[PDB]
Subunit: 440 residues, 4 copies
């Protein structure tokens, strides 16, 4: 499952259809990023540039020109073929091959962007540009507009209107095509296999980073080279740190370990969390907290559907949590009064759900308090958790327990499809899986 040339072209056209006549949209590639001295991080294309191109090179700009209501065309600026650069650093698409490969009308050398861009914008009414994203892109756009403003003796004119395309594009990204859902489904499956492998490999005395190693190897073998975010392996008290990434401790017999890891597959993110006993058996105290988080997730999975909202489902989870914490003596008082004072917040301090896509925290308008009404094609996470600080004023046996369980779902016409249910989360099914692996 991937996204094809034709789908990138469909996206480009859908944007053009929303653009005013006499306008151009400019979409810039991500800069390369230094890791240390002359070495760079592995390149990650800008998600919006990727959305419209599938093109993984730096020093590139997509220009979509809508001359009027019937006529439009596309120009790519990209690195030139260069024998020496390519012998060193790799092959470049170049200008001759780009139109056919990418499905754009025209390709020009990036080195010529300052000589050419103003000529493309000359006499247009509107320029669409995501200002403030990249400094280098802003310099290019501002120079072009300045040349035009100052070029009246050469009969040049600048567009007077600049529109941020991000609201429109991000609304596009919020609703997945069936092809995007298939890619996300595959990301969910790959990520799930990785988490299953981590549970089967985990033993007391291994380091947190060892499970990271297992997870990344499993991602890679299915063709997802990189994670969509830095892997979290938080055992014991580290599980109470939401994005713990040091992963530097030896995992102890008697502690839980919380793994939050996701692959990046054809650009798209998985995002799964599983929490499980290091020694394969939940203690009573661990199980008591786990059951509340699991009920929260299972209830959310029953509820999520078109016509509800993250806010509405969040309210149901908050009640489940407050009720459970009261029953365990972690909270004291009347459930409804406790809910009204957001008494769960010391233990559940993050959102239940975020959008998921080309970014793990995907683009798209949530509405106030994430009240936006859900519709088919939206993809989101469901991640209740409870984190009991080592020094919390609660019964001693719960201190230092950090539990999150996170699945990735797609809203359908009839409810939701869970993309990540192929890795177990019922505590008895976790224990069974680990018992089987521990026998070899």
């Amino acid at each position: 499952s991937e996204i094809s040339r034709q789908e990138f072209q469909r996206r480009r056209q859908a944007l053009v259809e929303q653009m005013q006549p006499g306008s151009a949209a400019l979409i810039f590639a991500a800069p390369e990023v230094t890791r240390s001295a002359d070495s760079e991080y592995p390149y990650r294309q800008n998600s919006d540039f990727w959305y419209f191109t599938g093109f993984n090179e730096p020093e590139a700009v997509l220009v979509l020109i809508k001359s009027d209501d019937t006529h439009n065309h596309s120009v790519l600026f990209n690195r030139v073929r260069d024998l020496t650069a390519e012998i060193w650093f790799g092959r470049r698409l170049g200008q001759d091959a780009a139109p056919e490969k990418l499905g754009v009308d025209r390709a020009l050398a990036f080195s010529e962007i300052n000589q050419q861009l103003y000529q493309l914008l000359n006499g247009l009414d509107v320029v669409y540009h995501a200002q403030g994203e990249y400094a280098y892109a802003d310099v290019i756009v501002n120079s072009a507009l300045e040349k035009l403003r100052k070029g009246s003796r050469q009969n040049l004119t600048a567009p007077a209107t600049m529109i941020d395309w991000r609201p429109v594009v991000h609304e596009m990204r919020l609703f997945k095509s069936p092809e995007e859902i298939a890619v996300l489904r595959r990301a969910g499956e790959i990520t799930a296999m990785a988490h299953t492998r981590a549970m089967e490999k985990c033993r007391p005395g291994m380091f947190e980073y060892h499970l990271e190693g297992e997870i990344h190897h499993e991602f890679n073998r299915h063709g997802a080279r990189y994670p969509s975010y830095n892997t979290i392996v938080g055992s014991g008290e580290n599980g109470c740190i939401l994005h713990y990434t040091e992963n530097e401790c030896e995992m102890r017999d008697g502690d839980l370990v919380l793994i939050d890891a996701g692959c990046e597959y054809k650009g798209y993110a998985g995002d799964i969390t599983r929490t499980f006993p290091v020694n394969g058996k939940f203690t009573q105290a661990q199980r008591e907290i786990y059951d509340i988080v699991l009920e929260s997730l299972e209830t959310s999975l029953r509820l999520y559907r078109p016509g509800t909202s993250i806010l509405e489902v969040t309210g149901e989870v908050v009640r489940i949590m407050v009720s459970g914490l009261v029953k365990l003596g972690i909270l004291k008082g009347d459930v409804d009064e406790l809910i009204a004072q957001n008494a769960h917040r010391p233990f559940f301090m993050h959102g239940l759900s975020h959008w998921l896509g080309l970014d793990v925290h995907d683009v798209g308008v949530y509405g106030q308090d994430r009240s936006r009404i859900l519709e088919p094609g939206m993809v989101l996470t469901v991640e209740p958790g409870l984190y009991i600080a080592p020094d919390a004023e609660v019964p001693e046996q719960y201190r230092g327990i950090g539990i999150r369980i996170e699945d990735d779902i797609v809203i359908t016409e009839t409810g939701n499809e869970n993309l990540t249910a192929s890795v177990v989360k019922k505590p008895e099914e976790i224990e069974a899986l680990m018992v089987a692996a521990r026998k070899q």
Copy 2:
């Protein structure tokens, strides 16, 4: 093997000993780096900051003050303890614990750097600063100096002299302590085990990225979480691309694969290349090219010692290469005339050796044409290669062969120690290893 608090302190003192009285040296941490939208790459500390601290947090500045020839002290600026930030993103050292943990005299909040730095520089004669490294650091230094220049009514004075500490510090880094060599020795061993594993796993039909996966998993399991540079797995014609990192092709029965991969262990880089047959057996043509590259490496390993230079050893390698290429009909003519016209350069177009340390292309002055005389404690690579382009005007059977063999060595009083000889490179030993693994 690691670098301890006491050694970081020794380095700080050695710098201070080289500083003028009435001076301060400023060393800034690396900024965090965006991968996409709100997600960041895993943090990599600036190598020079690391060299003096072993401290892996951003928003930190080491200030070494030499008041006069007997009196000096250190101040660290670093992030404050912050409950909410730490529940989310991880633990911070903070100010109270820093002096004991790091062995500095004083710690202050990074948020206060603009209120405090000018006060530390007031009345000093010299500021040591690596200008142009980080824009954010330059803004901080320039603001402090501007406050002082403009503050005569408040009896403030700016140092009139700014000295780049990089030449002095990089000369320090060029000569490894025995403890640094032990860490590099371990990096070499970990990297070697990874390359052995790649050779034992490789089969026709696997993708290049699969061997990357094996390599990274082996790095991780020995506690080297990250590579020191982006892994190269170039099979077939891809082997002729020096830093090929796409690693996207299916490895073919009958092709070679060139793996260039190294771990980063306690900050220090390994850098190994092995080239080997995908199907476990060199063809005659592959073996003929391989033998020349191997002779070049073995000869270089015999020669490298105090009192020679990379230039001098490079000359010996060039002769070996020209001679071998003449014998195969790849070059035609008289060896000495061919050498004089650098006729090897279409096939060997990079340097034989680079320094190795906290960066894979490590700091340190090479001298003109890498003529600097070698001394004990210097660490460098030895990486001859031959790359025969698919369209080279040479006997057909050699086209598309890319071979490099790279080891990491330390110059000793009596010659060199090879840190990476635990992964095989003799062609018969490669074939034996692969035959054994292929039988299971």
Copy 3:
């Protein structure tokens, strides 16, 4: 004659009437400008800021908010009252007095602009901003928009559309109100009195700068403290340098002197050039060139009216010039062929007319080749000239003669009114004026 509070308010409303509902226009004051070290040039307000305010302080921003089609209001950011600053550098309007003084709804401290501006733009659809004019203004606008884009958890939203208000505002400025014309009429009269004074004072042996001194003193005494541009006093060969401002030479008996000088009166520019003999008597050669330039100007003054253009009148001037230069032997050949090859261009190398207003080269669209059709209310210069280089290949007696004659006019329903005809330009009237002054 001046521009009143009510007229500034009318302009603000006319802008608001053109703005989209759900929008804000931002207009920024000019920065103060260093002359040397801690000393600054006398402050000149940004012309567009001035157009809407009549307010001559730095660190000020006019914000016009159009909430919807009936509701709108204005906010000024300006410097706070400050006892110490004012004892030193002068009185400030402050916040309490600004609404009544300027006729704005609300005033806030400039120091609070970063805390307040984003709140004013929150939830608007469009921001009108002249991007690239001032760096400091761009930083303020970009910060505000960035806060809003990134503030969705605080229910903030950025306008997605930014429109340059300069085309609309500059079109406003192009058409003068009767009150603006009265101010320009006064500027023309003041400037004319200055040029008359220069002619009456000029004697061989005086320096060019002496006539500058006379001119500036006359400007000042009528309440125009500053010139609208740097005064040009080009005697002899210096007259062939279009914007000669060194004014450093001793004026010679037998040379012409070209004075191009204009006052700035209530913000508005005069722009007059007169050329005249230093010794009070034109030579034959000087008179021969002068007559062509004068015919060009007199013809242009007869022609300029609604429905013609600068281009059309320029064609008539070019014919007059070519014809005259042919008659003198400066050009050789057939007039029409000479016109077709723009043979006048070595001697007349600038435009005949520019718009005139709050800038001497005033804002407004000229059309291609200054072809825009003239309408009542437009104000422009008429400045033919001929400049014969000291080394021109022409009859010797003409070399080093530089002559320009420039008047300022307003297009009326019935033609034009000459605002500067009160300083003489007929050569006999120049000689008479100078003869009278030279007798004392």
Copy 4:
């Protein structure tokens, strides 16, 4: 009186003599400065660039290279000859004529500075640069150093040391040559004639700006085209505003007017203040305050000499002021206690003296509290004043009186020479001068 080519050369050599061997000093011209839209302020050269060149063009850089202890040379970067630019905007020195005109060894085009500067700095140990003065200069220097740092494969090396030349150069500027003193003497005389003219012209009903006009005309006629700072004409309450420059009020019969104005002559500043009755006759109350300020000045003029300091003389003035204010009932109590509480500060809130030279507030170290011991060749102002706010809690008759009297002096071996004593300051001599002019 001016500064010659030979003296600029002597200054350059004196700098070179202070420079380390293997070093280059870079001195940059001032940028041109926008007044409004396409119009610029009249150009003012950077004072330090001027000090070493006498060259009044922008886009120029002086490079002084000290190869070793015997060998040194100079290179100027400056604008190329350009026919079209010069026909428009004026003559340029260009490269061919610069060495002879300025006395530099070599001249190169400014357009080539980025291609040439790094080559001049290559292999030097020290670069002298005034960092933070001009952004454009910093970009040029930083680019050159970056090319060198990064150019080891081309055998380039950057100097590791950057030294601010301003402390050394400003110490040079602090001590005037006899030729500089002659120029300052002439500036003092020109400025004095202007102030005399203002007193002779002043009548009730004239505007403050009218006296500015008289002053600037007098500056101009002696060849000082521009003031050294914005002229202050503060009548009545405006006299209590130290740098009042609006000069917009009608001068009233019965008020004083305070004029602070100085010419800029061959680069050097005059700085004179005279306060006098608008109607030619001091009131008793005005005379009572005036006498204290005059005694302060006359005493300071008797005292200033080598071996004293501005601090020491300031103490004598403070006693004179406190004593006088006690006698008038403006201050109440014991003089010595009043002095100890700085009770004069509401009425005298600025320094008595500043250095004077190429800037009106000239460069040079003052010492703590301006305690530096005076030496021959130093040039400074002497400007006591008393400013009684319109709402001060003092006897009513003194409210709104602002008086300053300022002379410019040079410290000599035997005391000081007053450069500005040719304009009267004794109240009887002011009244006599004004009475004579008022009779015509």
